[PDB]
């Protein structure tokens, strides 16, 4: 909407490229630490996203073993990073918080 919230994105694009998981062809949600909430969200993914997530992670563990990265052409662009897991994950948390609010009635 403005120029101030636009360099805010510029420093988030900066941190994104510095974090460097896009150099392994990975997306932000591929790097989330699996807890009980996350393991449930992954369980709920449709077959296409689950299989894609499996291969991207497998491709990255392969690269990490060789201490290599993908060509710059194949890095995950900050603009094209689909937060595919947070919708499922946010509903998992929402359900858990409901149980927790009932548990103290």
């Amino acid at each position: 909407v403005s120029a101030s919230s636009r360099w805010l994105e510029g420093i988030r694009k900066w941190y994104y490229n510095a974090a460097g998981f896009n150099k392994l062809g990975l997306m932000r949600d591929d790097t989330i630490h699996e807890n009980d909430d996350v393991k449930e969200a992954i369980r709920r993914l449709p077959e296409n996203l689950y299989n894609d997530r499996v291969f991207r992670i497998k491709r990255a563990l392969d690269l990490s073993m060789r201490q290599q990265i993908l060509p710059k052409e194949q890095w995950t662009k900050y603009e094209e990073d689909k937060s595919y897991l947070e919708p499922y994950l946010k509903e998992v948390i929402r359900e858990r918080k409901e149980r927790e609010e009932w548990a103290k009635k």
């Binding site: 296409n48 497998k58 073993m65 060789r66």
Partner: protein
Amino acid sequence: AEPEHDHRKRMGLKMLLMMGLLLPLVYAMKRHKWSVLKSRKLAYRPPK
């Protein structure tokens, strides 16, 4: 104070020479076995 001085250096020489042999040979055995993995190629072929 150190009567073992001369003998330890003679051993030290033998230790360096054996290491100069064994380190690259053991390194070569590691690379030999691991080469199956280091040159493996992956492909993803999902149904469409």
